[PDB]
Amino acid sequence: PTVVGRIPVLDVRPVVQRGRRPAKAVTGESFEVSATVFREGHDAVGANVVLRDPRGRPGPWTPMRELAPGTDRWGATVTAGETGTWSYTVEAWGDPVTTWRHHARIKIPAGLDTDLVLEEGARLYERAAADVPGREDRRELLAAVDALRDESRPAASRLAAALTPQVDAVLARHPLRDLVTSSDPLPLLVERERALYGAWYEFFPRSEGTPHTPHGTFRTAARRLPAIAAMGFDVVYLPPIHPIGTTHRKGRNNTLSATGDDVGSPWAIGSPEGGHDSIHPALGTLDDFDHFVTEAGKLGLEIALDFALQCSPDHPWVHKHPEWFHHRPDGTIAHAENPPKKYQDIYPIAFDADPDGLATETVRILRHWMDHGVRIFRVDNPHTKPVAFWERVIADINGTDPDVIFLAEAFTRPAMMATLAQIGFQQSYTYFTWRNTKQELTEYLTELSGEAASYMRPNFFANTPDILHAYLQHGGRPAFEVRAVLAATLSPTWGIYSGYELCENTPLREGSEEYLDSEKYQLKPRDWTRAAREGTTIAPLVTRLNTIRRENPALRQLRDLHFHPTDKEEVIAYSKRQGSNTVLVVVNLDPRHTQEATVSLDMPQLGLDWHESVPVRDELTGETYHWGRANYVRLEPGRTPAHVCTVL
Amino acid sequence: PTVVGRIPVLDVRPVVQRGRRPAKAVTGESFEVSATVFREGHDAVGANVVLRDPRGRPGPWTPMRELAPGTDRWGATVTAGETGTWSYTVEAWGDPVTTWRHHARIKIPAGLDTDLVLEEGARLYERAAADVPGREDRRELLAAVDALRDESRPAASRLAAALTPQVDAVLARHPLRDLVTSSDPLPLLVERERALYGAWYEFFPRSEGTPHTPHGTFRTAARRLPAIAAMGFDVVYLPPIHPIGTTHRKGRNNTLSATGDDVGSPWAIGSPEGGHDSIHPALGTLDDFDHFVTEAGKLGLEIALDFALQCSPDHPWVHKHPEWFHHRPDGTIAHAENPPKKYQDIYPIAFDADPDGLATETVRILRHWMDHGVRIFRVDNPHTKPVAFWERVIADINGTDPDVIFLAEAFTRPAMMATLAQIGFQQSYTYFTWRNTKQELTEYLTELSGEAASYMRPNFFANTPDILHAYLQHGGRPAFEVRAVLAATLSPTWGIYSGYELCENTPLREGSEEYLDSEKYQLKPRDWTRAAREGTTIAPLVTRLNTIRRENPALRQLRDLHFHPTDKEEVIAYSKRQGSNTVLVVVNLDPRHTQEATVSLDMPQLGLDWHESVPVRDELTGETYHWGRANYVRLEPGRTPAHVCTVL
Numbered sequence A, B: 001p002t003v004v005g006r007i008p009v010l011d012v013r014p015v016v017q018r019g020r021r022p023a024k025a026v027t028g029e030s031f032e033v034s035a036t037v038f039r040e041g042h043d044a045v046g047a048n049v050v051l052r053d054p055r056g057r058p059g060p061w062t063p064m065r066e067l068a069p070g071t072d073r074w075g076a077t078v079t080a081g082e083t084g085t086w087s088y089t090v091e092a093w094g095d096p097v098t099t100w101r102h103h104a105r106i107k108i109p110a111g112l113d114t115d116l117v118l119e120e121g122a123r124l125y126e127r128a129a130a131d132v133p134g135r136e137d138r139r140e141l142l143a144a145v146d147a148l149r150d151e152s153r154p155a156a157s158r159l160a161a162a163l164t165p166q167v168d169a170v171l172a173r174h175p176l177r178d179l180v181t182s183s184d185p186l187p188l189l190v191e192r193e194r195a196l197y198g199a200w201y202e203f204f205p206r207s208e209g210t211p212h213t214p215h216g217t218f219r220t221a222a223r224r225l226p227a228i229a230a231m232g233f234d235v236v237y238l239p240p241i242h243p244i245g246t247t248h249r250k251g252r253n254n255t256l257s258a259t260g261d262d263v264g265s266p267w268a269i270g271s272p273e274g275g276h277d278s279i280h281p282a283l284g285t286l287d288d289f290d291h292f293v294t295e296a297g298k299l300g301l302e303i304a305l306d307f308a309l310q311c312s313p314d315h316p317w318v319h320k321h322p323e324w325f326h327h328r329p330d331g332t333i334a335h336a337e338n339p340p341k342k343y344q345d346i347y348p349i350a351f352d353a354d355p356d357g358l359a360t361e362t363v364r365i366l367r368h369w370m371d372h373g374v375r376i377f378r379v380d381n382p383h384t385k386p387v388a389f390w391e392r393v394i395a396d397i398n399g400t401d402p403d404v405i406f407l408a409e410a411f412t413r414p415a416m417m418a419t420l421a422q423i424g425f426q427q428s429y430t431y432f433t434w435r436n437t438k439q440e441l442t443e444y445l446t447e448l449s450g451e452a453a454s455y456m457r458p459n460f461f462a463n464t465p466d467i468l469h470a471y472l473q474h475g476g477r478p479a480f481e482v483r484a485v486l487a488a489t490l491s492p493t494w495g496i497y498s499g500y501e502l503c504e505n506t507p508l509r510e511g512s513e514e515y516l517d518s519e520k521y522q523l524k525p526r527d528w529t530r531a532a533r534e535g536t537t538i539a540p541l542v543t544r545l546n547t548i549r550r551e552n553p554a555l556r557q558l559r560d561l562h563f564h565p566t567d568k569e570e571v572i573a574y575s576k577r578q579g580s581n582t583v584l585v586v587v588n589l590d591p592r593h594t595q596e597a598t599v600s601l602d603m604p605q606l607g608l609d610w611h612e613s614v615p616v617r618d619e620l621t622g623e624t625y626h627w628g629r630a631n632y633v634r635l636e637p638g639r640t641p642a643h644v645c646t647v648l
């Protein structure tokens, strides 16, 4: 058997790790399948993509086209249906009809071998008709044959009969394919919509307490949920909800020694009160948690729990499973680190003594939370645990529960980030917060929406409790508005950490990306009602952005994205399209000065002619404009950061 | 089982078609194996390449290095040994000793639990010691352990004892490797030297006849061979040596109708006198051919026969095997074409009728000529025959006779050229003749010496009987000299077609790359003794260049090639290196005007420091210069077309 088939079809894409891992999609998501296709000699080829579902059923007729002259690179758009494991192949074939048409269009007006040429055509159309299932279509082709086979008609008329629109249409749906040759199947993993699309909100339940009881419970915190749903979020991410260690507990502002009533870091998981399968007592009971999850569900909110595979010195595992830790010669355990960050309040897990036990317990914990309605897990620092560990665990869980979504919080080097996405993580944190210039945003989103989209789904958190970027520190509220517009419109999944709405932007110190008085080490009660009343929140803008996303399919996908040139470095423009839905966004990245620029739109990417002029509506303001190949903007920081426009 | 191992090792290169075909090398050839390597956490990693020969024997320990900071791409040079099918794997591992040294070098002068750190090191070196086979190396490590375990000595001294060069050297040879994780093996095909390296000469035996017998025989043509060997060529390529058809035979200058004693195209193979396994009667007998091959061998010349899978209308197959041709409805067979070229004197083969018969007869023919000492075949237009046909034939032949070399004459699109190389062709023709500017040469050779070298070996014919480039037409002898230097020094394999050294450069008509009075359609007697006597030939230069190649290993490999900047578009500079041998070449691409320029050498690429000044000798003249980071050169057409310099 040969590696190359009768008609060469090579380098089918997307492909992940030479086919040992699946490419990714979600229900209803479109993407391009491509291949290198050609044959020997000078005759024509055709090609088509055959997509098969988990039950083995082939998809619709899906012909490919050469993507650029002389490249032999062919492609077509496909769309994923029901969730599950699909497969796809590319079929390549000789296209004798196209070749015959090519020669005939030349030879008939030249009187060259006309009887012979027309007869060759008749014999081809006969073969074509042989494989057409519908009887009227078949008869249409046989009628073409018969007209071709008629020496009483002029050569030009005989040829013309072979060139009618109805014939073109039949051959379009059921072409005569010579020597059909197939690629080897590639795996495609189709997961649910929320894996790609959703708006996330992070907050600390313990901060949402009462005057009488400052430490919030699930019962008290659930009162915040309606406000979160009203802002249009779909997923709530909670920091670890388990008991917190006392030994080496951190004090306020990440100080080494807790004093008095310091509450410590949620990531310092575990005490005699229980471990990762337990709830912090100040939060309430398992029944209270169930209540919280239910109220969230009623409001259209899914819960994402933090999973941080590490533990405090007081965690039961420390004495129950000593071999789950690396011990120095005196038996002591060094606290965990991810330099230059130090985590004096926790021990790291060692994975090479009892990998089976660690995996088994991990999936036991996960399956526990899944039993209590948690179908999403935000995984802390997975890059400091073995890659194959996550591969195994995720495979186990999704093996039984494919709806479960895992989000990789890996701010690290590109190789590790990519590998983690490839082995099963449904979503990944990204370099987004560190991409603020037009060049940074454009290059990075070009990357994310490009080849990487075949294995990675980005979750754009505009901030996190560990990351307050300088852009926001120096820029204030207009910057929050800009970053919100950007995050919300560039990724089908985005998120913020509570306080972002209030434009909280005071750093621990100059040069730091930490918050002053960080919520990680102390309760941080917020007067939401007052902020709302005094209008010092961008919650309305957040709500509008999520509504716009909910009303415009173009913003609920990733791969279709195009940047348009402007004449100002501070002003960026880009468009996203999904079916007949087109959204155009123009953002002023300068949070301090009014910026005017001319935007020169790439009209064919919008599906328009260069001379054409089209009506747009700015969904942030309701204003309408008429935009063409050259458009003036128009952006004043504070009054408006950006246009988020739909094409009318 | 997981796709990723304990220590990730990913995207191992070189790789051909995702592992379904082998990467290529020849005996003695070095190339880089690379991989993406990293681990969880922050500890150091190490990596090494394992080459296993056809009997499964591993090569030496071959450690990798990170090729660039922060990229996680690691690489090492390996060298191929005996011919056959090899395999290679990359091993990745934790490097705990490197990690420990890093931490210890900081912590010990600082006084941070130094007893503990030194004990960790001692226990580590004990582990490292356990694996070392050598007794003395073992004693050296255990001595380091004991010095580490000596609280009577200063901490800095205990640590210093662990850092001596002797110890570095031991761990450098037998490092302590944690959690060794291997890639899946990739195949490497090692073929004989001549597959990569050799000088080729094409000529028509029929032109070397006598006053009394104008049509040459193998016995008369054999008298031309000494001069060819004297020019330093290793391989002689003969156009088809079979009987030539009479039906529709072409006349002189590619005219439609032969008249009189017109000799026709050698590529119009076959008559009732015999087919592809027979010899043209005017050339003599099989015995005469055996004599020719023997005399060539005596002179150190190998024969490459043209294999052109096509037929004159008089070929026996036409009536013996009608199904090997595509017939039109009137039973006639359309003549072959390669648009816009027309081959009115031949029929093309049809392959999907009796594929086995065609393959069987092809390999039968090849084995016939192999039995008469032909171990190289130059294959005509393989891209107009099915790719899998060649894959099959070459696999079949090399399965029994791995020394046989196939050269693909496929001037076509890049995808086909690459695929043909990848499926088994030992050598490929290239776009060389159409790369004449500095930009063209640099970019194309960058391509060929880069990733493509994993599957393709270039044969630089500076001309062929079908290609007389405009550069040569307008430039005359100095241009022939330039292209000779370029071809001979840029590829380890190059060639010319007879008459090149005479600077034959008259085209068929303006705008053509065909020769006037082409040898393809007529006897072309040349008075070689006279040409030599009158000095109107660059045969001595050819001889000199081949001598330089034979004397300088740098020119007998492909992959090591670097271009150095000059301040003139018309002046190109590049270096090639193999071990301690370095060749530096500077070429004036202007064949009409003296050019002077400054050549600024990239000294690290030469293995020299930026301040160094090095003696070089131009092997074309014997002249010596002293060159450094910036050098004046003056190159004069007709006198000094180029410098071909050796270092020291």
Ligand SMILES: O=P(O)(O)CN1[C@H](CO)[C@@H](O)[C@H](O[C@H]2O[C@H](CO)[C@@H](O)[C@H](O)[C@H]2O)[C@H]1CO
Pocket (backbone or CB within 6 Å): A250, A254, A265, A266, A267, A268, A308, A338, A341, A342, A343, A344, A345, A346, A380, A381, A409, A411, A465, A466, A520
């Ligand atoms: O490196 P990163 O992943 O960005 C930080 N990780 C989490 C991100 O999800 C942070 O919440 C957390 O860092 C906090 O918690 C640590 C231990 O609980 C503290 O030592 C540190 O003082 C604080 O910052 C730590 C968890 O693993």
Ligand SMILES: O=P(O)(O)CN1[C@H](CO)[C@@H](O)[C@H](O[C@H]2O[C@H](CO)[C@@H](O)[C@H](O)[C@H]2O)[C@H]1CO
Pocket (backbone or CB within 6 Å): B250, B254, B265, B266, B267, B268, B308, B338, B341, B342, B343, B344, B345, B346, B380, B381, B409, B465, B466, B520
């Ligand atoms: O397309 P290319 O491969 O470069 C042309 N093929 C050979 C090269 O290997 C050429 O020598 C050869 O073209 C010659 O032979 C033809 C038929 O024998 C003639 O029609 C043409 O008049 C002549 O030129 C033809 C063979 O296959």
